[PDB]
Design a protein around this ligand. Structure first.
Ligand SMILES: *[C@@H]1O[C@H](CO)[C@@H](O[C@@H]2O[C@H](CO)[C@@H](O[C@@H]3O[C@H](CO)[C@@H](O)[C@H](O)[C@@H]3O)[C@H](O)[C@H]2NC(C)=O)[C@H](O)[C@H]1NC(C)=O
Ligand SMILES: *[C@@H]1O[C@H](CO)[C@@H](O[C@@H]2O[C@H](CO)[C@@H](O[C@@H]3O[C@H](CO)[C@@H](O)[C@H](O)[C@@H]3O)[C@H](O)[C@H]2NC(C)=O)[C@H](O)[C@H]1NC(C)=O
Lengths: 49, 49
């Protein structure tokens, strides 16, 4: 559903546990190539994998 | 070096152990989106992850 309007820029406002799962599922579906953008909306940017 | 001539189609002639490592490093560098091709050149196509 995020490919209906051809969305390129996503802000992830999740905690230290959900961000890793969302990044793992993005990597599984393959949406981390050059052309997109992500923001890890917390203070622990180095906490995730 | 495989992006010099803009290669799209890669045949992987490796055993059951090296194929998983190559697929993991492709997923790490992000070259498994729609547009590329792969051939797992062994009899154990369902053996890998
Ligand atoms: C950061 O993420 C965004 C979203 O994917 C992308 O931003 C684009 O980055 C390019 C650099 O590759 C920039 O283009 C520049 O545009 C300015 C306009 O003033 C121009 O003067 C420069 O010569 C250059 O062409 C731009 O900031 C930005 N937007 C567009 C439309 O290109 C990109 O993925 C990431 N950018 C960086 C720098 O990390
Ligand atoms: C992965 O994606 C699809 C599914 O296997 C493959 O797409 C098919 O590619 C062939 C070769 O380019 C297409 O044939 C072409 O048809 C056009 C239209 O007549 C013709 O002008 C070309 O000369 C060529 O014969 C075929 O149409 C296309 N299938 C569909 C449904 O569009 C693709 O090759 C696969 N492999 C990759 C990307 O390595």
């Amino acid at each position: 559903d995020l490919e209906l309007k051809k969305e390129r820029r996503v802000i992830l406002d999740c905690e230290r546990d959900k961000v890793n799962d969302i990044v793992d599922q993005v990597i599984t579906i393959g949406k981390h190539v050059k052309g997109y953008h992500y923001i890890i909306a917390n203070l622990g940017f180095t906490d995730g994998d």
